[PDB]
């Protein structure tokens, strides 16, 4: 009813180009008011995209995006109000050769004072021009070679391991990944990670100079983290032995779908994680029984294949008694927005959306009185509630602008009087926005970000440091000038995936380390707990194995 005359419209020029995206925003509270939201796209003399403007900023004469291309429409230069200005270029082989980022402006011209220049180097002729190295250079600083690739040859030794033409050695920001063995099906059977020495010091950075692996291996810590895989004839992974020797095993059904999984801790016997798993005709999980005897049953809508039921239960005849642990029931609008959720064990979450399918109202329950939502988790309610009066109902309202920026979350918990409003202050010349506690002035929001658009302050006393690639480097939790700070740092692999997390708190010093490996989290706590977290599935089931400090 709220959606009458709210279509999506695309408006064209005379050369088949989409120059306008038109939406129609209508709030259920004010169903007589319909906002026509228009996104503008301007194309140049060559038929390529030159400018894009959201409905909000267009009114204020600011351009969300500007592009400058080559004669074929490939973007070379970009101006973003959110991501700042950037410059990229590819070669004649289609390979990326340069990317300059974190550029702003002010004085009119582009500010390169903090520009990050990443360049890509490839094998030269007569080689097939495979990726050779990746160099990263921040303005005013020295260039670091952050990546290097080494490829195997044609020797019988290499062929027997199926390594010919494969990148056998990958030096990234964290250290080294070696590919030891490849399946007949072209899959890796053995990979080994070595860490760069002293990654605990945030000032030590990878820099693979030259073309000698001997000189590099000396920079690596001694430990070798080897993950071993065994795949089936169709190239699917059957067994996995992690770096500490635990095995995950899977089995597939006649249709090749995961049908069972097992775990064999090092020195232990094989045990069931997933006993049986059935699927719908559409290949969606239907019934899943685990090693704990617990059964999850998924209910789907026949017309739409939408998930309308999730039932986790201890079934009849279970050793610990039959009990429905969770029974989620979903009700959707014709388009597929979640209108309501129920759980059997009366509790109900109701949802209202605008004509753009933005969530404007949400009802639910919380342990009241919690207090105003922040970065913290609530204190855990221990033990498990027997009575539900321990919960109170809340209603939240959400307020968005023309560019989809969430400006307001109004929390209303009347009975316990736990009422508050989280305000987000949005810039008037970008989509940059921060909580009002940082600033309530739109004109000061952009300074709180980098030129790339990465936030520099999390909360009031908390600052954010970023890598040249725009990866989160350090969260400064409690600053103490000089020089003992509560902080948490991060490290990433060449694919920008997190490999290491180091938290530090003053008490000598509580240091919590997290090493992320295939199917494994290696977490140490000092100031000593040595925890190995086996991750099963892809992560669904987790196993906590202490080598030391089991509470």
């Amino acid at each position: 009813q709220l959606f009458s005359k709210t279509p999506s419209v695309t408006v064209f020029d005379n050369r088949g180009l989409s120059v306008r995206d038109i939406a129609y925003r209508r709030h259920p509270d004010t169903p007589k008011v319909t906002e026509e939201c228009i996104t503008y796209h301007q194309f140049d003399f060559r038929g390529f995209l030159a400018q894009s403007l959201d409905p909000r900023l267009n009114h204020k004469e600011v351009t969300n995006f500007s592009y400058l291309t080559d004669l074929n429409g490939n973007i070379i230069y970009t101006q973003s109000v959110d991501a700042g200005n950037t410059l990229v270029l590819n070669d004649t082989e289609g390979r990326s050769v340069i990317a300059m980022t974190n550029i702003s402006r002010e004085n009119g011209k582009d500010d390169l004072s903090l520009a990050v220049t990443r360049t890509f180097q490839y094998e030269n002729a007569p080689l097939p021009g495979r990726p050779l190295s990746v160099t990263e250079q921040v303005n005013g600083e020295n260039a670091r070679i952050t990546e290097h690739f080494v490829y195997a040859g044609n020797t019988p030794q290499e062929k027997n391991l199926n390594l010919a033409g494969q990148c056998v050695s990958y030096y990234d920001a964290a250290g080294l990944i070696q590919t030891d063995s490849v399946s007949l099906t072209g899959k890796p059977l053995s990979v080994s990670r070595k860490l760069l020495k002293n990654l605990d010091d945030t000032n030590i950075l990878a820099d693979w100079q030259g073309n000698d692996t001997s000189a590099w291996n000396s920079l690596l810590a001694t430990e070798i983290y080897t993950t071993v895989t065994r795949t089936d004839a169709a190239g699917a992974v059957l067994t996995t032995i992690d770096a500490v020797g635990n095995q995950q095993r899977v089995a597939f059904d006649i249709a090749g779908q995961l049908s069972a999984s097992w775990l064999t801790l090092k020195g232990g016997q094989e045990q069931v994680i997933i006993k049986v798993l059935t699927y719908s005709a559409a290949g969606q999980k239907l019934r899943e029984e685990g090693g704990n005897g617990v059964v999850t049953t998924y209910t789907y809508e026949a017309e739409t294949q939408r998930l309308i039921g999730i039932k986790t239960e201890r079934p009849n005849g279970h050793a610990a008694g039959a009990k429905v642990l969770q029974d989620l029931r979903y009700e959707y609008d014709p388009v597929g927005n979640v209108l309501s959720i129920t759980n059997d064990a009366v509790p109900e979450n109701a949802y209202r959306y605008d004509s753009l399918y933005q969530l404007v109202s949400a009802s639910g329950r919380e342990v009241a009185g919690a207090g105003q939502q922040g970065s913290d988790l609530p204190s855990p309610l221990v033990p498990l509630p027997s009575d539900s009066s321990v919960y109170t109902n809340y209603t939240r309202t959400y307020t968005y602008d023309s560019a989809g920026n969430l400006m307001r979350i109004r929390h209303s918990a009347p009975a316990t009087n736990n009422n508050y409003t989280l305000n987000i202050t949005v810039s008037e010349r970008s989509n940059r926005g921060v909580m009002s506690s940082l600033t309530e002035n739109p004109a000061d929001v952009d300074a709180l970000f980098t030129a790339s658009g990465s936030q520099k302050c999390l909360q009031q006393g908390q600052s954010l440091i970023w890598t040249p690639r725009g990866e989160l480097r350090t969260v400064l939790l409690v600053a103490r000038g000089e020089t003992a700070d509560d902080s948490e740092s991060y490290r990433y692999d060449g694919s920008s995936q997190r490999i290491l997390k180091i938290s530090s708190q003053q008490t000598s010093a509580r240091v919590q380390r997290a090493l992320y490996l295939p199917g494994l989290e290696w977490r140490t706590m000092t100031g000593a707990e040595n925890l190995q977290v086996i991750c099963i599935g892809e992560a669904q089931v987790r196993v906590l194995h202490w080598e030391s400090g089991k509470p």
Binding site: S4, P7, E93, A233, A255, T278, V335
Partner: protein, 1457 residues
């Protein structure tokens, strides 16, 4: 971009299609065409590209009525006079166009002397003359090669194709059709050899007609029989590379020097699939067809006795595998069998089928492609019915049913006073059947003159004396005027000035001429060997008794029928006897003999009238007569000399009906129509995979009556330009036997054009086509409405073409005025240009003719009853230019037609605000290549005061749909040049050279009110002129090697391609970021380089370009094959190593020394084995159709061997049936194996079952097999079944049996193994892919774990309880069915089903699916665009297309309300 060669095993399997056969799109000629590409190998790449093709306008031949499978040829002109083998003879291009001796560039007759050709010295001297056709299509170069000394040898033809190919026609006697009495008198030169710049050859060997398997009577009747040729064998994949034609050598290469053969069998081999055809023919000799026929177009007899029964592919596998060639016999690869409905009148091609062979010799078959035709049926002859249209006549009043005006349908000619002749034109009867004919108001004949006993007269008029009038006379003692009217075309051309035998026949001249049928005329006289004497109890007449297309001489007595062949120019040949006709000498009366084509065979049949009976003797292909058909008169009628009877095509169908008037009998007027449709026309196709197309013809004459009715109702005057009936593609019904859905395509024709001056069919001026969906559901659940496309084509006649634009839709007052044809003269000294001119009347005839068949306009409508239904979705119109080209003929210019302008409007059924684009070819070179062209995008029209779009939209959308970018006039200029190699005796045109594009943008105010034309664009004040500012868009260049500099040689080897990336304007992307030096060294490092700007003006700066696509090639001895490839110079080369005869590449080595090796199955030249860069083996097994039916792989892992057992170690036999394959046990040494079942839609029938049901010990089985009701391997053929039923019926026992027998859509089974065969945990995954009769993916079934599913019955429906609810069962034979789709006739997914479980892999019926399974329905518009979706839940999504915006409404948007 250049493709880099990568060795891979055939990675496919699943889908099932056919040979790529297709019905032709309906065109302005109205003919039904069909085409089947020959399913044989392309060899190295140079191969015969033959298609077996059908045309409803074609005659009989070596592939049956209407079919042909021939290569290019050059013949003498016959259509405007019979050739006499003198210098006045004319020659036709392979396109059928008349040629003239061409002029050279110096302005003289292009004649030369030659003693050398292609570097090969000729034994003697030749006079070489260049010929040029009146219409240029492909700029081919045609040379006539005549020995200077006539006795030195025979002449032949050379055709240089613009692709650099050279073709020689009729060099030796097998490739020449020549006079049986004088081999020098050549009628036709057939293609004999083709050579390409790569030194690859194709040789065409023909067999001459002979007396093998002919009866003695046939031999006696046709001694001159050696003329005709039949395609016998095609040799390709020549082992020796040679740039020059082999026919120029002293001797042709041995037969062993061709890797590939295509053999044509004419019956000498066993037709059985159980007998494998050998490369060697004989000694049984080719069979003689029952319907032998002669043609006499060339003034010589050509006898035709042979039919092609098999087409065969042969490879020299030993030679291709580089094994010992000694005593090699080429092996059969693919076999195409052809079934004919053999008939003494007309034999029809009724089936083509692929058959191939396993190593064990077992036949593996494809489903047959079947055809059937409209047939004359004596049992379905309509009886007599009264003819009320003659009610006004007393019953003694004489009349003649004749097409007086030339409308294709005869009207009523009579004498009213007497002395006064009046005519009633045929007209569409009102209210009656769609083809019912009445006759309009009388109209006075012009003053009839009457003199030399017979005089000419113009009636229509035309200015053409089209009518020969005679008068009966005179006996006895009776004073008396009653005349006879005879169409001039029923007489030999040389009737009034007879020479030879005609003069010997007529003498002083004939006394009288009396029509005895539509095109047969009885002769009445004054009072070598061996003409009849006109004036006994005999009949002498002119009639086509031979079906050859001429008015022959015929004598009929009580016991004889003799025919003398009209050989042209007054010459008549030796008499032919046609047995079969007899009447007692005591009752035989010549007056009671009528000559007409009754069965539409082409031959004139005999109709003899008795007092109570009419006997009809069908003419069997001019050889004899059938046993007579007895037509009883209506009860009470006794035919005598006071009664009136005539044979006339009163239906306008090209076949004679009978009009009888019997006084003293009421009613007095009677009709007998013997057929309602023209027989021998293809009307059904079925591929036995689920697709059937039914065809429907309608005469051009009926169409003319309808058109004339509409014209007369519109106050205008009807003018017919089509004087005879043509059978036009009227309707196609495309039927999906699996879903039961149909698509109807309907055609209407108007403005029919036949040219009297050149005696030539020009075609139709307007063609309207309706497309209507017809769903088996038979509800309105998919509410589609028919689409309508109105198209206008040029006829080449101004009197017709000038009236077409008036019919154009005029609902858009702002639309630009219609295009007009542009005529130019060519000025190539030395770049060339077209100069517009107004041709003389005489020149205008030919230059206008050049526009024959060109599409002028097209409008697309949706007939959905909406208010906007009369406004087209889109309109497209074209402007054509004819370049006049002078030859040695001073009176006929040669011509080249091209589409110089195209304009498209997108209205989307809103007349006021369309989009408009226009493409214009401004300059073309001497060979038709575009030099200067422009694409134009017009601005949007000015915003109106009110919205022309629905008020269902938001009220602001109209205003907000306007954007300034819609107001900018865009013109995109495109320049290009070419390399043309025409020096010496080579001919290679249109080689890519340079191209450049520039942009022009203007304000709406500068847009011309009447729009752009070519003249507007070459004008000095052009918007794209040299003065105007522009935006450089880029350029492209091709550089060649070896090669003068970077220019091409005949081999056209590309060195690299070079395209512009950056110029001074785009370089501004670097400004605030990098300085010039840094930018330049970056670009240089990234592989870019500076090159001159092409088509440079005013010192334009060089542009940064990218060069890609580098190849190194071998020499002539390696057939110029690529030896190395690389994308740019930034990387290393990949090396190619070819096999022995350079057919395929067997090894690649990239730039890191990685080596990939392949081994090929040489019956398909596809790889079957692959060794990868890590020395791993990959292996496939191919079935006899090149399909992968098993695959495995092995090699090493961690030193140890893995995983699948080698074929040597553990052979695997793929189960012969799916039932067996499903029942396989683990431990199979294959990763995949496949079973293909493309014939599963044909019901399976065994000899045993039929014989057990009929208890006839095999009788019915043997008969059904013989007629191909069923194939030898036991598949029931659809059309064979229908034909059989139509001729013999079928026992109810067989009906019962067949009802017990299930069908299943064409499908494939693919089994995929989980582990290597050494692993006992191995599972066999099972996936079955379904295809429909159109090659579309029907559904996919995957074997899943046991569980709950619906239950499929044997009848393919769902098992439901009594109430109708589907049963739910638990089974271990459960399948997950995904992607189930119900298509319409256009291949669009009308129903996409949710996945479902079933207790069988077999196809669940569409009835049960539509009733019980959830699906989203998709509704498409006439443009094939989805505009509505009804979800299973019942919600709707809609999409509205307007020229300037698309509106999208989802489930929420439409739910209200």
């Amino acid at each position: 971009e250049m493709a880099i060669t990568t060795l891979s095993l055939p990675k496919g399997g699943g889908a099932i299609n056919g040979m790529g056969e297709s019905v032709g799109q309906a065109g302005p000629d109205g003919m039904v065409t069909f085409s089947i590409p020959l399913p044989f190998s392309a060899g190295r790449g140079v191969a015969p590209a033959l298609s077996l093709s059908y045309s409803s306008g074609a005659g009989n031949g070596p592939f049956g009525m209407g079919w042909q499978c021939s290569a290019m040829s050059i013949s003498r002109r016959t259509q405007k006079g019979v050739p006499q083998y003198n210098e006045d003879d004319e020659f036709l291009s392979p396109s059928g166009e008349v040629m003239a001796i061409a002029l050279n560039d110096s302005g003289f007759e292009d004649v030369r002397t030659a003693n050398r050709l292609q570097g090969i010295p000729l034994p003697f001297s030749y006079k070489v003359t260049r010929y040029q056709p009146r219409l240029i299509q492909d700029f081919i170069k045609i040379e006539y090669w005549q020995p200077v000394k006539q006795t030195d040898g025979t002449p032949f033809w050379i055709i240089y194709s613009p692709d650099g190919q050279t073709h020689i026609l009729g060099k030796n006697s097998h490739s020449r059709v020549a006079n049986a009495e004088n081999p020098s008198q050549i009628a036709s030169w057939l293609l004999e050899e083709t050579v390409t710049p790569t030194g690859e050859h194709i040789y065409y060997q023909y067999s001459g007609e002979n007396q093998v398997n002919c009866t003695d009577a046939e031999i006696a009747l046709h001694p001159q029989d050696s003329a005709q040729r039949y395609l016998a064998r095609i040799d390709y994949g020549n082992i020796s590379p040679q740039a020059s034609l082999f026919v120029l050598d002293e001797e042709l290469p041995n037969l062993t020097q061709w890797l590939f053969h295509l053999v044509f069998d004419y019956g000498e081999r066993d037709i059985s699939i159980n007998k494998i055809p050998t490369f060697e023919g004989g000694t049984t000799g080719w069979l003689a067809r029952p319907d032998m026929f002669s043609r006499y177009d060339f003034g010589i007899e050509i006898r035709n006795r042979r039919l092609c029964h098999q087409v065969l592919g042969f490879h020299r596998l030993e030679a291709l595998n580089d094994r010992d060639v000694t005593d090699e016999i080429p092996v059969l690869v693919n076999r195409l069998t052809l079934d004919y409905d053999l008939n003494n009148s007309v034999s029809t091609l009724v089936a083509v089928r692929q058959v191939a062979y396993e190593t064990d010799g077992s036949p593996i078959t494809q489903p047959p492609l079947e055809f059937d035709y409209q047939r004359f049926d004596t049992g379905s002859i309509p009886g007599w019915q009264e003819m009320p249209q003659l009610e006004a006549f007393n019953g003694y009043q004489p009349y003649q049913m004749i097409d007086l005006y030339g409308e294709g349908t005869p009207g009523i000619l009579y004498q009213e006073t007497p002395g006064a002749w009046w005519y009633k034109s045929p007209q569409r009867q009102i209210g009656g059947d769609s083809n019912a004919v009445t006759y309009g108001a009388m109209k006075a004949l012009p003053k009839i003159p009457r003199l030399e006993g017979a005089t000419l007269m113009d009636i229509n008029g035309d200015g053409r004396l089209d009518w020969v009038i005679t008068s009966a006379g005179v006996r006895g003692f009776h004073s008396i005027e009653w005349t006879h009217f005879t169409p001039l075309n029923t007489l030999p051309t040389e009737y009034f000035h007879p020479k030879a035998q005609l003069a010997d026949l007529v003498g002083a001249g004939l006394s009288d001429l009396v029509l005895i049928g539509p095109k047969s005329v009885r002769l009445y006289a004054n009072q070598n060997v061996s003409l009849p004497v006109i004036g006994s109890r005999q009949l002498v007449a002119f009639a086509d008794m031979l079906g050859s297309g001429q008015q022959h001489l015929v004598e009929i007595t009580a016991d004889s029928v003799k025919c003398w062949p009209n050989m042209g120019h007054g010459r008549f040949g030796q008499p032919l006897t046609l047995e079969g006709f007899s009447q007692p000498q005591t009752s035989f009366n010549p007056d009671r003999v009528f000559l007409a084509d009754i069965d539409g065979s082409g031959t004139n049949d005999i109709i003899y009238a008795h007092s109570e009976c009419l006997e009809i003797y069908l003419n069997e292909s001019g050889n004899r007569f059938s046993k007579p058909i007895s037509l009883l008169l209506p009860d009470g009628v006794n035919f005598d000399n006071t009664c009136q009877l005539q044979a006339a095509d009163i239906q306008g169908l090209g076949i004679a009906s009978l009009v009888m008037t019997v006084p003293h009998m009421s009613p007095t007027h009677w009709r007998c129509d013997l057929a309602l449709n023209k027989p021998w026309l293809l009307n059904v196709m079925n591929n036995n995979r689920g697709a059937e197309t039914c065809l429907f013809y309608r005469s051009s004459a009926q169409f003319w009556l309808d058109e004339k009715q509409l014209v007369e109702a519109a106050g205008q005057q009807p003018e017919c330009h089509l004087p005879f009936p043509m059978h036009l593609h009227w309707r196609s019904e495309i039927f999906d036997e699996i879903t039961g859905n149909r698509l109807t395509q309907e055609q209407e024709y108007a403005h029919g054009s036949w040219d009297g001056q050149e005696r030539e069919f020009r075609g139709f001026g307007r063609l309207i086509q309706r497309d209507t969906d017809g769903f088996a559901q038979g509800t309105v659940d998919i509410p589609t409405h028919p689409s309508r496309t109105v198209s206008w084509f040029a006829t080449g006649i101004p009197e017709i073409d000038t009236t077409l634009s008036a019919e154009f839709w005029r609902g858009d007052d702002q639309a630009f005025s219609p295009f007009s044809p542009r005529f130019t003269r060519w000025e190539d000294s030395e770049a060339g240009s077209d100069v517009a001119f107004i041709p003389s009347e005489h020149d205008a005839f030919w230059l206008n003719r050049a526009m024959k068949g060109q599409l002028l306009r097209s409008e697309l409508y949706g007939d959905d009853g909406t208010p906007e239904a009369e406004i087209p979705y889109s309109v497209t119109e074209m402007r054509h230019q004819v370049r006049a080209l002078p030859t040695t003929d001073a009176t006929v210019p040669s011509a080249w037609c091209s589409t110089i302008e195209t304009r498209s409007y997108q209205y989307q059924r809103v007349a006021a605000d369309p989009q408009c684009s226009q493409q214009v070819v401004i300059k073309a070179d001497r060979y038709g290549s575009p030099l200067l062209s422009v694409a134009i995008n017009y601005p949007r029209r000015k915003k109106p005061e009110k919205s022309p779009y629905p008020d269902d939209l938001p009220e602001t959308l109209f205003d907000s749909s306007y954007d300034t970018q819609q107001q900018q006039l865009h013109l995109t200029k495109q320049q290009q040049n070419y390399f043309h190699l025409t020096n010496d005796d080579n001919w290679l045109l249109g080689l890519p050279k340079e191209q450049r594009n520039d942009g022009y943008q203007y304000d709406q105010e500068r847009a011309p009110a009447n729009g752009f034309t070519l003249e507007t664009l070459i004008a000095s004040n052009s918007l794209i002129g040299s003065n105007q500012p522009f935006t450089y868009l880029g350029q492209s260049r091709v550089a060649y090697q070896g090669g003068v500099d970077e220019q091409p040689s005949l081999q056209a080897l590309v060195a690299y391609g070079e395209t512009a990336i950056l110029d001074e304007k785009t370089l501004q992307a670097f400004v605030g970021v990098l300085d010039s030096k840094t930018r330049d060294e970056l670009l240089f490092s990234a592989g870019y380089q500076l090159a001159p700007r092409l088509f440079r003006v005013e010192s334009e700066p060089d542009v940064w370009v990218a060069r890609q696509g580098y190849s190194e090639f071998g020499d002539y001895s390696q057939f110029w094959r690529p030896l190395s490839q690389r994308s740019t110079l930034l990387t290393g080369k990949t090396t190619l190593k070819w096999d022995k005869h350079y057919c395929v590449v067997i090894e690649t080595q990239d730039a890191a020394q990685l080596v990939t090796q392949a081994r090929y199955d040489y019956r398909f030249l596809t790889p079957y084995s692959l060794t990868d860069a890590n020395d791993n083996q990959h292996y496939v097994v191919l079935n006899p159709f090149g399909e992968v039916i098993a695959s495995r792989f092995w090699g090493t892992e961690a030193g140890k061997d893995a995983g699948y057992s080698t074929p040597q170690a553990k052979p695997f036999v793929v189960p012969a049936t799916i039932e067996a394959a499903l029942a396989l046990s683990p431990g199979i040494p294959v990763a995949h194996c496949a079973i293909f079942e493309p014939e599963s839609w044909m019901q399976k029938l065994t000899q045993h079952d039929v014989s057990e049901r009929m208890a006839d010990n095999g009788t019915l089985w043997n008969a059904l097999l013989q007629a191909r009701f069923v194939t030898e391997d036991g598949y029931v053929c659809a059309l064979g079944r229908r034909r059989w039923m139509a001729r013999h019926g079928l026992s109810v026992l067989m009906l019962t049996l067949l009802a017990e027998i299930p069908r299943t859509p064409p499908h494939s089974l693919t089994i995929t193994t989980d582990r290597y065969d050494s692993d006992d945990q191995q599972q066999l995954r099972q996936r079955i892919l379904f295809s429909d009769g159109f090659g579309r993916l029907l559904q996919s079934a995957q074997r899943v774990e046991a569980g709950e599913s619906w239950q499929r019955s044997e009848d393919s429906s769902l098992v439901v309880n009594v109430s109708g609810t589907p049963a739910l069962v638990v089974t271990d034979n459960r399948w997950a069915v995904s992607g189930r789709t119900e298509y319409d006739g256009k291949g669009q997914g009308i129903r996409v089903y949710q996945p479902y479980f079933l207790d069988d892999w077999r196809y669940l019926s569409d009835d049960s699916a539509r009733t019980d399974l959830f699906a989203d329905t998709h509704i498409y518009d006439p443009l094939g665009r989805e505009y509505q979706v009804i979800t299973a839940k019942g919600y709707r999504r809609e999409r509205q297309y307007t020229p300037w915006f698309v509106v999208n409404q989802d489930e929420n948007d439409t739910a209200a309300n």
